[PDB]
């Protein structure tokens, strides 16, 4: 009733002051007592209000997952919150803030073994979608971060994930579906195809989707063609 709705009383101008800082400290610290944890974590409207990330000094630097404080369902709302925090940087001070947010999304892969196809693909789609931000500094060290997640934070053989096939044609293709973004977002895929063949974990024709998507666009992509083809036999000669 009072907090979310009434915009005239509670504006950006109000809770930048010390009163607002103490208010947000007490409200976010309310998710520590065992009595109130379940209601606040499970509520939808609380998380909708907690997407109050606008202007700067909105308790914007403070409003992390408390402060990189993970547990130690409902992950889509916090994922969107991290998404908005990371996308806030568009310029002078919040670039490192955004990088810390990207690393927080990287850390999110590890914590809870409760993992499903939709949740994981939401994470990868968010990381790849962060390349769209026009700043180069955020974009390059976002894509290397998503490489780090794809390599060092995923194992294919599970009940909840089959192999790299749907991993390629899942959430990545929304990014592929922007013209100048191809040469990075394909090249990262060219890593992940071959790295898992350090073991040999891909059938002979399972990788054809990458051979399908690359020519699906149509001249750098044509000039990038033979470079993509030639390592297929370097795999044969090694790794």
Short mmCIF file of C-alpha atoms in Angstrom, two decimals:
data_model
loop_
_atom_site.label_atom_id
_atom_site.label_comp_id
_atom_site.label_asym_id
_atom_site.label_seq_id
_atom_site.Cartn_x
_atom_site.Cartn_y
_atom_site.Cartn_z
CA UNK A 1 0.00 0.00 0.00
CA UNK A 2 2.40 2.68 1.24
CA UNK A 3 5.88 1.93 -0.08
CA UNK A 4 5.44 0.61 -3.62
CA UNK A 5 2.44 2.63 -4.76
CA UNK A 6 2.68 6.17 -3.36
CA UNK A 7 5.14 7.84 -5.70
CA UNK A 8 4.66 11.42 -4.51
CA UNK A 9 5.80 10.67 -0.96
CA UNK A 10 8.63 8.28 -1.88
CA UNK A 11 10.68 9.71 -4.75
CA UNK A 12 14.33 9.35 -5.78
CA UNK A 13 14.98 12.64 -3.98
CA UNK A 14 13.86 11.24 -0.62
CA UNK A 15 15.89 8.12 0.12
CA UNK A 16 19.27 9.34 -1.04
CA UNK A 17 19.56 11.07 2.36
CA UNK A 18 20.76 9.44 5.58
CA UNK A 19 17.18 8.58 6.57
CA UNK A 20 16.82 6.55 3.39
CA UNK A 21 20.16 4.83 3.91
CA UNK A 22 19.11 3.73 7.40
CA UNK A 23 15.69 2.72 6.04
CA UNK A 24 17.20 0.52 3.33
CA UNK A 25 19.73 -0.88 5.80
CA UNK A 26 16.97 -1.95 8.17
CA UNK A 27 14.73 -3.28 5.39
CA UNK A 28 17.44 -5.33 3.66
CA UNK A 29 18.79 -6.52 7.02
CA UNK A 30 15.25 -7.75 7.75
CA UNK A 31 16.15 -10.80 5.58
CA UNK A 32 18.25 -12.35 8.37
CA UNK A 33 15.77 -13.19 11.13
CA UNK A 34 14.37 -16.70 10.78
CA UNK A 35 10.80 -15.47 11.29
CA UNK A 36 10.72 -13.11 8.29
CA UNK A 37 12.99 -14.93 5.80
CA UNK A 38 10.37 -17.03 4.02
CA UNK A 39 7.82 -14.27 3.47
CA UNK A 40 10.26 -11.72 2.09
CA UNK A 41 12.12 -14.23 -0.08
CA UNK A 42 8.90 -15.73 -1.44
CA UNK A 43 6.92 -12.53 -2.00
CA UNK A 44 6.60 -11.12 -5.51
CA UNK A 45 5.80 -7.52 -4.57
CA UNK A 46 8.84 -7.23 -2.29
CA UNK A 47 11.13 -8.21 -5.14
CA UNK A 48 9.30 -5.88 -7.52
CA UNK A 49 9.93 -3.01 -5.11
CA UNK A 50 13.54 -4.14 -4.74
CA UNK A 51 14.06 -3.28 -8.42
CA UNK A 52 14.51 0.36 -7.30
CA UNK A 53 17.74 0.99 -9.20
CA UNK A 54 17.49 4.44 -10.79
CA UNK A 55 19.68 7.55 -10.99
CA UNK A 56 22.74 7.03 -8.74
CA UNK A 57 23.33 7.18 -5.00
CA UNK A 58 19.95 5.43 -4.78
CA UNK A 59 21.63 3.03 -2.41
CA UNK A 60 22.67 1.76 -5.85
CA UNK A 61 26.20 0.69 -4.92
CA UNK A 62 24.93 -0.84 -1.67
CA UNK A 63 22.09 -2.82 -3.24
CA UNK A 64 23.87 -6.04 -4.13
CA UNK A 65 22.66 -9.50 -3.16
CA UNK A 66 22.94 -7.75 0.17
CA UNK A 67 26.70 -7.52 -0.49
CA UNK A 68 27.77 -10.62 -2.48
CA UNK A 69 25.89 -12.56 0.23
CA UNK A 70 24.42 -15.70 -1.34
CA UNK A 71 22.67 -18.58 0.43
CA UNK A 72 25.42 -20.27 2.45
CA UNK A 73 12.63 -21.04 -7.35
CA UNK A 74 12.40 -17.18 -7.37
CA UNK A 75 15.80 -16.72 -9.05
CA UNK A 76 14.40 -14.92 -12.11
CA UNK A 77 13.60 -11.73 -10.17
CA UNK A 78 17.03 -11.47 -8.55
CA UNK A 79 18.56 -12.31 -11.93
CA UNK A 80 16.68 -9.38 -13.46
CA UNK A 81 17.84 -7.19 -10.58
CA UNK A 82 21.47 -8.07 -11.33
CA UNK A 83 20.64 -7.50 -15.00
CA UNK A 84 19.45 -3.94 -14.34
CA UNK A 85 22.43 -3.23 -12.07
CA UNK A 86 24.83 -4.39 -14.79
CA UNK A 87 22.99 -2.50 -17.53
CA UNK A 88 23.00 0.71 -15.47
CA UNK A 89 26.52 1.52 -16.65
CA UNK A 90 26.27 3.40 -19.95
CA UNK A 91 28.79 6.28 -19.80
CA UNK A 92 32.13 7.28 -14.67
CA UNK A 93 32.15 5.39 -11.32
CA UNK A 94 29.72 2.52 -11.99
CA UNK A 95 31.86 0.68 -14.56
CA UNK A 96 33.64 -1.25 -11.81
CA UNK A 97 30.25 -1.67 -10.14
CA UNK A 98 28.93 -3.31 -13.30
CA UNK A 99 32.01 -5.52 -13.59
CA UNK A 100 31.47 -6.68 -10.01
CA UNK A 101 27.85 -7.43 -10.92
CA UNK A 102 28.99 -9.51 -13.90
CA UNK A 103 31.38 -11.43 -11.66
CA UNK A 104 28.48 -11.94 -9.23
CA UNK A 105 26.46 -13.52 -12.04
CA UNK A 106 29.52 -15.67 -12.72
CA UNK A 107 29.62 -16.71 -9.05
CA UNK A 108 25.88 -17.53 -9.17
CA UNK A 109 26.56 -20.69 -11.21
CA UNK A 110 28.38 -22.40 -8.34
CA UNK A 111 26.37 -21.92 -5.17
CA UNK A 112 23.23 -24.10 -5.19
CA UNK A 113 23.12 -27.45 -6.95
CA UNK A 114 19.38 -26.87 -7.47
CA UNK A 115 19.69 -26.07 -11.17
CA UNK A 116 17.26 -26.43 -14.07
CA UNK A 117 17.41 -25.83 -17.81
CA UNK A 118 15.39 -22.60 -17.71
CA UNK A 119 17.38 -21.10 -14.80
CA UNK A 120 20.78 -21.86 -16.33
CA UNK A 121 19.68 -20.58 -19.73
CA UNK A 122 18.40 -17.41 -18.07
CA UNK A 123 21.90 -16.91 -16.66
CA UNK A 124 23.66 -17.49 -19.99
CA UNK A 125 21.14 -15.36 -21.88
CA UNK A 126 21.69 -12.52 -19.40
CA UNK A 127 25.48 -12.73 -19.72
CA UNK A 128 25.39 -12.82 -23.52
CA UNK A 129 22.72 -10.10 -23.64
CA UNK A 130 24.99 -7.81 -21.62
CA UNK A 131 27.24 -7.53 -24.72
CA UNK A 132 24.53 -5.27 -26.24
CA UNK A 133 25.60 -2.38 -23.96
CA UNK A 134 27.46 0.12 -26.22
CA UNK A 135 30.43 0.51 -23.86
CA UNK A 136 33.40 -1.57 -25.00
CA UNK A 137 34.93 -2.00 -21.54
CA UNK A 138 31.81 -3.65 -20.14
CA UNK A 139 31.26 -5.74 -23.28
CA UNK A 140 34.67 -7.38 -23.75
CA UNK A 141 35.11 -8.34 -20.09
CA UNK A 142 31.50 -9.53 -20.07
CA UNK A 143 32.03 -11.93 -22.98
CA UNK A 144 35.26 -13.29 -21.51
CA UNK A 145 33.31 -13.74 -18.27
CA UNK A 146 30.61 -15.75 -20.02
CA UNK A 147 33.37 -17.87 -21.56
CA UNK A 148 34.66 -18.44 -18.03
CA UNK A 149 31.19 -19.56 -16.93
CA UNK A 150 30.67 -21.85 -19.94
CA UNK A 151 34.05 -23.55 -19.46
CA UNK A 152 34.68 -23.65 -15.71
CA UNK A 153 31.11 -23.73 -14.29
CA UNK A 154 29.16 -26.31 -16.35
CA UNK A 155 29.23 -30.09 -16.78
CA UNK A 156 27.02 -31.53 -19.52
CA UNK A 157 26.09 -35.04 -18.30
CA UNK A 158 23.12 -34.58 -15.97
CA UNK A 159 19.39 -35.14 -15.75
CA UNK A 160 18.92 -31.37 -16.24
CA UNK A 161 21.29 -30.92 -19.22
CA UNK A 162 21.94 -33.22 -22.18
CA UNK A 163 24.88 -31.94 -24.26
CA UNK A 164 26.19 -28.88 -26.09
CA UNK A 165 23.52 -29.14 -28.83
CA UNK A 166 20.63 -27.48 -26.99
CA UNK A 167 23.21 -25.41 -25.11
CA UNK A 168 24.02 -23.78 -28.46
CA UNK A 169 20.48 -23.53 -29.89
CA UNK A 170 18.86 -22.52 -26.57
CA UNK A 171 19.34 -19.02 -25.18
CA UNK A 172 22.30 -18.06 -27.38
CA UNK A 173 20.19 -17.99 -30.56
CA UNK A 174 18.02 -15.16 -29.13
CA UNK A 175 21.26 -13.18 -29.10
CA UNK A 176 22.04 -14.44 -32.61
CA UNK A 177 18.57 -13.48 -33.89
CA UNK A 178 23.24 -6.59 -33.70
CA UNK A 179 24.89 -7.29 -37.08
CA UNK A 180 28.29 -6.14 -35.79
CA UNK A 181 27.95 -8.45 -32.75
CA UNK A 182 28.47 -11.66 -34.75
CA UNK A 183 32.27 -11.93 -34.84
CA UNK A 184 32.56 -12.10 -31.04
CA UNK A 185 29.51 -14.21 -30.21
CA UNK A 186 30.39 -16.84 -32.83
CA UNK A 187 34.08 -16.97 -31.88
CA UNK A 188 33.26 -17.78 -28.25
CA UNK A 189 31.16 -20.68 -29.54
CA UNK A 190 34.16 -21.83 -31.57
CA UNK A 191 36.02 -22.17 -28.27
CA UNK A 192 33.30 -24.09 -26.45
CA UNK A 193 32.85 -26.55 -29.31
CA UNK A 194 36.50 -27.62 -29.23
CA UNK A 195 37.28 -27.34 -25.50
CA UNK A 196 34.86 -30.12 -24.53
CA UNK A 197 36.53 -32.23 -27.25
CA UNK A 198 39.59 -32.30 -24.98
CA UNK A 199 37.83 -35.46 -23.78
CA UNK A 200 36.01 -36.20 -27.05
CA UNK A 201 32.51 -35.43 -25.77
CA UNK A 202 30.58 -34.69 -28.94
CA UNK A 203 29.23 -37.13 -31.52
CA UNK A 204 30.23 -36.96 -35.18
CA UNK A 205 27.15 -35.05 -36.42
CA UNK A 206 25.89 -33.53 -33.15
CA UNK A 207 27.83 -30.32 -33.89
CA UNK A 208 26.00 -29.74 -37.22
CA UNK A 209 23.85 -27.05 -35.56
CA UNK A 210 26.90 -24.77 -35.46
CA UNK A 211 27.37 -25.63 -39.12
CA UNK A 212 23.67 -24.77 -39.56
CA UNK A 213 23.54 -21.47 -37.64
CA UNK A 214 26.68 -19.96 -39.18
CA UNK A 215 25.28 -20.04 -42.73
CA UNK A 216 21.78 -19.17 -41.47
CA UNK A 217 22.57 -15.43 -41.46
CA UNK A 218 23.12 -15.10 -45.22
CA UNK A 219 31.02 -10.45 -46.15
CA UNK A 220 33.09 -11.17 -43.04
CA UNK A 221 30.89 -14.17 -42.19
CA UNK A 222 31.81 -15.73 -45.53
CA UNK A 223 35.46 -14.76 -44.98
CA UNK A 224 35.15 -16.19 -41.45
CA UNK A 225 33.83 -19.44 -42.98
CA UNK A 226 37.00 -21.39 -43.78
CA UNK A 227 38.59 -20.44 -40.46
CA UNK A 228 35.58 -22.01 -38.75
CA UNK A 229 35.81 -25.09 -41.00
CA UNK A 230 39.53 -25.80 -40.78
CA UNK A 231 39.82 -26.59 -37.05
CA UNK A 232 37.33 -29.47 -37.56
CA UNK A 233 40.29 -31.54 -38.82
CA UNK A 234 42.73 -30.00 -36.34
CA UNK A 235 40.41 -31.74 -33.87
CA UNK A 236 41.25 -34.93 -35.79
CA UNK A 237 44.98 -34.21 -35.54
CA UNK A 238 44.51 -33.31 -31.87
CA UNK A 239 42.09 -32.39 -29.07
#
